Every structure is written in C-alpha cells, then in structure tokens.
C-alpha cells in the first residue's frame, strides 16, 4: 500500500528515559494494509513498530529522546517526512528505567 500526503507534527515533548514525546500524523494512502513506521535519527527511538492505515486517518505515536530539541524525520511505508519540535526538561530526576 503506497503512501501520499504525509505531514507529521508534534504536540508535546519531554526528554527523558520514559516515552515522553507524542506526535500526531496525517496520511492519505490509496489502499489499506500495514506499513512500517520508523524515525531515521539516532536520538529518537520510536515505540510503535507497525500500524494499520486507512484512507484519511491519523496516527498518534510515542517516542523518547535525550536531545533538548527534536529535529528528526519519521517514515511511513517508504517515504520521509520532517517536523520540528521543542522539548522541555523533566521534573522526576530519578527513575527506575534506563
């Protein structure tokens, strides 16, 4: 299922060890199936491995970063998309997770 009209955008971002950031996403695929979701940086690990696409739907994702801001590109099903952000420092400065 090929892909068209993708535009990611962020809503909130902390940089921590827990999955803090959360970004919404638009996509206009011509068909339906399962397309891989990935970020091609090395400072943003993305939790959702796969998704189920539809015609005019939207996907909420989760990620975790350590950079004080996020400028990275996500990828649905073959083609790239860019979106900036602004990440804040967290408050709980001892947590039980690496």
């Amino acid at each position: 299922p090929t892909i068209l009209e993708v535009s990611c955008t962020v809503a909130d971002c902390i940089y921590s060890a827990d999955f803090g950031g959360s970004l919404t996403l638009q996509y206009k695929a011509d068909r339906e199936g399962h397309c891989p979701v990935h970020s091609h940086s090395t400072t943003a690990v993305l939790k959702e491995a796969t998704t189920h696409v539809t015609a005019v739907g939207s996907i909420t994702l989760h990620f975790s970063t350590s950079s004080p801001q996020a400028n990275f590109i996500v990828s649905l099903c073959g083609k790239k998309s860019t979106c900036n952000a602004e990440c804040k420092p967290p408050a709980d400065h001892i947590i039980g997770e690496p």
Partner: protein, 49 residues
C-alpha cells in the same frame, strides 16, 4: 454605658466574629500559595484521548 460599638460592625475585610473559641471566621485577604499532589491513577496516556 460608654462602651462603643462592638467588633462585629468595625472589623475590616468582612470578618464574622465567632466568640466561643474567639474566632474571626470567613474573611478575605492575601493569596494562599498551595500545591496539589495529583495521584497517578487519573491519567490516561495521550494515545487514547
């Protein structure tokens, strides 16, 4: 005979004077800097809202 008016019609800021513990209840001055510890059970994650 020369007592003057009581405190219930002279006290500023709208205080009502209860006498039995000698209180000045229910009046308004300043700000009250508080902080609320929200429990972690009333939070659904942002993929579901």
């Amino acid at each position: 005979n020369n007592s003057g008016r009581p405190l219930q019609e002279t006290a500023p800021f709208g205080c009502k004077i209860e006498v039995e513990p000698l209180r000045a209840s229910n009046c308004a001055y300043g700000h009250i800097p508080i902080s609320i510890d929200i429990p972690d059970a009333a939070f659904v994650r942002s993929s579901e809202s």
